């Protein structure tokens, strides 16, 4: 019977704040840049449609003394941070970017056709682009955001798969990594495996697996500590209607229509897909640059961040604007030519983070200790309670070893600087450790925290 | 605060448990089985059978599931908190109904290992020919028995053991044996009194016995080892009756492995120049059946049982094994392929064999709770921890910690289906072992006066009313 | 209340099963007597009972 | 989707525009009791979900 964390925790009188200076990122939207022979990246691939993952460390409070420390016993207890309120700054001038693909499976317009279409040749693919669904979201919690996507599994073995069969589908959770892609409205799946053509969608998503949050499974967590909070806004509407062109997988049973002739002798491809179209952006639906205030969340955590660790993940479509510039290789000739000008594409990124925090202590009993150890026992390691008596009676040093009379060949125990088991999972990083301050008044954000609760502005 | 003291060796199940004031019953309608006595019927090419072999001479297994204590409704539940406690069924009393008329069956074999009849011999017999094997049948020993417990029934049988290596095995040697314990399975063959063993590996001629027992392993229960259990929970109760007697005196015809030293006799001559086979075997026969010998169709009632189990059926689970020899009679009928011709023709009639089978189960039960300390938990987890698995442990800590549970994606999926074709995890530890099943779990009733069985249960103790 | 005041009960014979293993014309050779009369009407199903 | 010669469906036809119909069974309350049931007579009365 999991309980509300607010049972045993106690709230203190003290608050702090710290925040990064700012964050800044530059990259090309469409593909990463690398030396042609080498594999080393020359320029990182970045675009707004990439997700963002922020990992934030806190320094251990219990290393951090206080102006007056007497009010608790640091022996019998600990200190753990709590996250009251959060902000996300975004500074760019708002504007919509865009993507396309030079080759795209397409037949022709489905909206209006005077006469029946032409015969299918080989490779009618064309250069056409579209706007992605506008979207805004925000994610906060102590465990990484859990993603999900479509994907291929292994077919049950009865019929041996021949090339050209329909691969069965599988619903798959995974941890979410940076650089991963929002839905365009084509749904979370692996194009790379499930789309052989590789030309069926615009570039940016062709490589990787777009993913999407599952509120259910996440919120389904018993502790809720995946995410305790969130917001989302998004919209879309239709623009155009097209046709795939390719080998028909299956033909409709005739009985659902009547045989044609002449022009109607043959059936055009059955497929259709919409072209998503972003809508008018407003300054209103912006969910950012405005404070937030948390008291109660759906999970039992109330702003507890275990292990001095905290996660934020945010994605915007509104700043997607892509500036394009031109350099001149020859500055002399006065006759304009398309020869003289190379073109490059770079995209801007601007983030800022400012986090309120609250300070909290924990009493211990067995019940306490037990209940935690159930939840996540690794947490106990970074604290001092867990004992754990060691062994180690005798050793033999034989010195010295380079002396080339052979005593045994040697020391094998590096293995445990390892702390993050998720070190396999890469994503953007920032360290705050140094930045705390003890007085709200000196910051833009905090004084609102005062204003919300009022209290004195403090004398002078 | 660390595991505390108190006593055990084992203990009375009636030590800690308490009894409630409430009872219930449920029971099947009935069951039915038909099949061929001797051997199952399959399509010649297909391994899958057309018809199963069925005989009373086959052992019968029964395994009965029960519903959760915790999900189940009571007229008055006040008396307890399911927090600090659990609840488990109690088995007070049990019945076996049998509805068929009683009569003997029989079995035999068309090619029987046979020498002669020494029960009467007017002259020295003939001498070894080739394949004199004959067709005879016999009546197996009339027998009844009943077995009840929360744990699988254990029988025992002979088996051929791995010899040692000093002298290598020569063809035709007598392999040494090891008496083997094993779990009892459905359809297994009741020993006829020829010993619990594998005829297959031990008897190569395959012509020694009637068909039914030729292949498989006839088994026999060990009271000792069963009763020897520390918990008694193998079986907490039982009954048996059986009888048999001699009929004929015969011999085995075959080459003699080891021969009688002369010192035991005087060397013969002429018709006595040759020792006739000294292997004799009796003809087993059943005797007159009686209404009286029925140990069935009458209620049984328990208060103290030999083990420590009193009526406790763990894991919502219960086992019963039964043996009837009385109803063994097998009917036979003739299907004429040609109905026209008026003269009798052997070729006109295909012949068939099927046998009737009738059972029922009607079970009283009592309801009981367990107070919890670590002591308790200690002892059971000591005994078996698995039973703590199915429960929430009365709770895992005093505040109910949880496993980061499994909430699934399952119920229907993509026509991909590793999503289960490989179905729900865990196991029946005996899922390997095959034997019959029935579910009663819906059938309970809260009022006994409904039923023939239960109203007796009153009459035994008397109602004074039926309250609560 | 098989019947109007509180006697209760529907007193012809109730339960029967004829099979176990499979030879005889199956338990389901007769129709299913108990009905949601809408069984004619198909549609998606879920069981919560547990 | 169905086998061409057969009538057996190979793949079920589904789209969002199909209506959905969910049927939900509940277990009878009056088989199912409570931490404390004394508050009522189950004989003279019944229980029904809401």
Curated annotation (Swiss-Prot), chain A:
InterPro entries: Capsid_L1_Papillomavir, Capsid_L1_sf_Papillomavir, dsDNA_vir_gr_I_capsid. GO terms for biological process: endocytosis involved in viral entry into host cell; virion attachment to host cell. GO terms for cellular component: host cell nucleus; T=7 icosahedral viral capsid. ISGylated by host HERC5, this results in dominant-negative effect on virus infectivity. GO terms for molecular function: structural molecule activity. Its main location: virion. It comes from the Viruses. The keyword Heme does not apply. Signal peptide: none annotated. Keywords: Capsid protein, Disulfide bond, Host nucleus, Host-virus interaction, Late protein, T=7 icosahedral capsid protein, Ubl conjugation, Viral attachment to host cell, Viral penetration into host cytoplasm, Virion, Virus endocytosis by host, Virus entry into host cell. It is found in: Virion; Host nucleus. HAMAP family: PPV_L1. Self-assembles into homopentamers. The capsid has an icosahedral symmetry and consists of 72 capsomers, with each capsomer being a pentamer of L1. Interacts with the minor capsid protein L2; this interaction is necessary for viral genome encapsidation. Interacts with protein E2; this interaction enhances E2-dependent replication and transcription activation. Interacts with host KPNA2; this interaction mediates the nuclear localization of L1 capsomers. Interacts with host ITGA6. Interacts with host SDC1; this interaction promotes efficient infection of keratinocytes. HPV16, in comparison to HPV types 6 and 11, is more often associated with malignant genital cancers in humans. Forms an icosahedral capsid with a T=7 symmetry and a 50 nm diameter. The capsid is composed of 72 pentamers linked to each other by disulfide bonds and associated with L2 proteins. Binds to heparan sulfate proteoglycans on cell surface of basal layer keratinocytes to provide initial virion attachment. This binding mediates a conformational change in the virus capsid that facilitates efficient infection. The virion enters the host cell via endocytosis. During virus trafficking, L1 protein dissociates from the viral DNA and the genomic DNA is released to the host nucleus. Belongs to the papillomaviridae L1 protein family. This is Major capsid protein L1. It comes from Human papillomavirus type 16. The gene is L1.
């Amino acid at each position: 019977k999991v309980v509300s964390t607010d049972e045993y925790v106690a709230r203190t009188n003290i608050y702090y704040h710290a925040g990064t200076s700012r964050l800044l990122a530059v990259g090309h939207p469409y593909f990463p840049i690398k030396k042609p022979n080498n594999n080393k990246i020359l320029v990182p691939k970045v675009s707004g449609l990439q997700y963002r993952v922020f990992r934030i460390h806190l320094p251990d409070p219990n290393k951090f003394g206080f102006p007056d420390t007497s009010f608790y016993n640091p022996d019998t207890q600990r200190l753990v941070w709590a996250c009251v309120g959060v902000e996300v700054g975004r500074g760019q001038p708002l504007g919509v970017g865009i993507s396309g693909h030079p080759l795209l499976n397409k037949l022709d317009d489905t909206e209006n056709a005077s006469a029946y279409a032409a015969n299918a040749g080989v490779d009618n693919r064309e250069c056409i682009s579209m706007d992605y669904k506008q979207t805004q979201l925000c994610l906060i919690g102590c465990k990484p955001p859990i993603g999900e996507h479509w994907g291929k599994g292994s077919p049950c073995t009865n019929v041996a798969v021949n090339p050209g069969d329909c691969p069965p589908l599988e619903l798959i959770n995974t941890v979410i990594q940076d650089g991963d892609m929002v839905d365009t409205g084509f749904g979370a799946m692996d194009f790379t495996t499930l789309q052989a053509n590789k030309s069926e969608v615009p570039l940016d998503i062709c490589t990787s697996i777009c993913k999407y949050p599952d509120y259910i499974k996440m919120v389904s967590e018993p502790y809720g500590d995946s995410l305790f909070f969130y917001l989302r806004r998004e919209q879309m509407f239709v623009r155009h209607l097209f046709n795939r062109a390719g080998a028909v997988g299956e033909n409709v049973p005739d009985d659902l229509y009547i045989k044609g002739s002449g022009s109607t002798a043959n059936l055009a491809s059955s497929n259709y897909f919409p072209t998503p179209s972003g809508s008018m952006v407003t300054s209103d639906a912006q969910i950012f640059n405005k404070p937030y205030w948390l008291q109660r969340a759906q999970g039992h955590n109330n702003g507890i961040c275990w292990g001095n660790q905290l996660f934020v993940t945010v994605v915007d479509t509104t700043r997607s604007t892509n500036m394009s510039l031109c350099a001149a290789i020859s500055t002399s000739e006065t006759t304009y030519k398309n020869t003289n000008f190379k073109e490059y594409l770079r995209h801007g990124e601007e983030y800022d983070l400012q986090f309120i925090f609250q300070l909290c202590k924990i009493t211990l009993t067995a019940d306490v200790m037990t209940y935690i150890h159930s939840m996540n026992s690794t947490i106990l390691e970074d604290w001092n309670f867990g004992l754990q008596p060691p062994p180690g009676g005798t050793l033999e040093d034989t010195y010295r070893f380079v002396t080339s009379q052979a005593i045994a060949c040697q020391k094998h125990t590096p293995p445990a600087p390892k702390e993050d088991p998720l070190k396999k999972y890469t994503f953007w990083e920032v360290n705050l450790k140094e930045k705390f301050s003890a007085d709200l008044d000196q910051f833009p954000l905090g004084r609102k925290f005062l204003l919300q609760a009022g209290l004195k502005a403090k004398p002078k």
